[PDB]
Amino acid sequence: EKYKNILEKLEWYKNKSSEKYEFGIYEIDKREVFITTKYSYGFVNNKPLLPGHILLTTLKKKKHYNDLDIEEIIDINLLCNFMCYIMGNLFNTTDFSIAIQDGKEAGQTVDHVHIHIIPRKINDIRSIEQMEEEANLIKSYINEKFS
Amino acid sequence: EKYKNILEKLEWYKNKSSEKYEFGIYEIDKREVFITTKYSYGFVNNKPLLPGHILLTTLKKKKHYNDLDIEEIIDINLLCNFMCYIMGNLFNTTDFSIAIQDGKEAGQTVDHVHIHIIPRKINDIRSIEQMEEEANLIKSYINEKFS
Amino acid sequence: WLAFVLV
Amino acid sequence: WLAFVLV
Ligand SMILES: [Cl-]
Ligand SMILES: [Cl-]
Structure with missing residues (x-):
């Protein structure tokens, strides 16, 4: 019910x-x-740092985290928590690196607020085919567990 | 009004x-x-990576990000956005590294969910005295701008 | 962790 | 950025 409740909030x-x-x-x-x-x-990363590296972004282009409205902050962050749950179940891990490079001096390369979610394990370029396959696995799992 | 509205939501x-x-x-x-x-x-870091490095945590001890309830996820994330605004004004920067080391394999050293907010600038241990001084500067600024 | 800020 | 994951 926690995650179903988040999905209802995310519409x-x-x-x-x-x-x-x-x-x-x-x-x-x-x-x-x-x-x-x-x-x-949420979309799969074409240049993953590690397997399962995903990105979350706003539908509206906003450069800085502080450009987001209250509704957008809640939405992107509830999606982040939900996606750590999904990725946790798919990549068999409880550990994640979660981060926002909020600005050029924080290493941001694309001028649009995004959250990195990277599954992590002990002592840890992609084609459209591999990316479609990865996105399909994630989408299929969400559908199976949440309707 | 955006930040005043967040503070109302944070009670x-x-x-x-x-x-x-x-x-x-x-x-x-x-x-x-x-x-x-x-x-x-929110509290000042005793071992800052860079100046203005702060930490946000839940009042209730919860190990993983996915242990948080919906209300806690919203609260800690609205506080994060609010604190990037405050730190931005205090440290004269628009850029921040925002991160959660969600688990031991992500480098978590304290078993309690926390967000790192690190102000960032081009080509960028503390005593109770320095920490009290830094926390006082932040608290004083919040009070001055938000009542 | 441990290769960049803050991974 | 650029010293750990993900700073
Ligand atoms: Cl861009
Ligand atoms: Cl601990």
Whole structure:
């Protein structure tokens, strides 16, 4: 019920999608997106630091974390907590590195607020095929457990 | 009004405090705490990576990010956004490294969910005196701007 | 952790 | 950035 309650707050439903996915000046392929919410979306990383490295971003392009409205802060953060639960179940881990590079001097390369979620294990470039496969595994799991 | 609205959601008021501040097996000195909310608190770091390095944690000891309730996730994350605004104004920066080491394999050393907020600038141990001084500067600024 | 700020 | 994951 905790995660089902978060999904209700995120206004999620199976197959919810956006017509387009903007990330800074870039456009994310719909095949790489595993979840869309009222204000955010989650997509697989083309340059993962480690396996299962995912990104969460706002549907509206906003550069800094402090540019987000209260509703967007809640949305992206409830999605983060929900995705750590999903990734935890999929990658068989309880440990994650969660981070925002909020600005150029924090290492931000794309001018659009995003959260990194990286599954972590002891002593730990991708094609559209591998990315679609990874996004499909995540999307399939969300659908199976949450309707 | 955005930040005043967040403070209302955090149930904050000038001088709001807790009888005790637990952080894992450790206890944080009240002099090092700059803000207390309905579910969280913010305190200055005794081993800062860079100047202005602060920590946010839950008042209730919870090990993993996924142990938090919906109300706690919202509280700690609205406080994070609010504190990036405050620290931004105090340390004269728009850039921050924001992170959760969610578990031992992510480098967590204290078994209690916490967010790191580190102000960042181009090409960037503390005594109770220095820590009290830093917490006082933060607390004084919050009070001045938000009542 | 342990290669960049803050991973 | 650039010394640990993920700073
Ligand atoms: Cl960009
Ligand atoms: Cl501890």
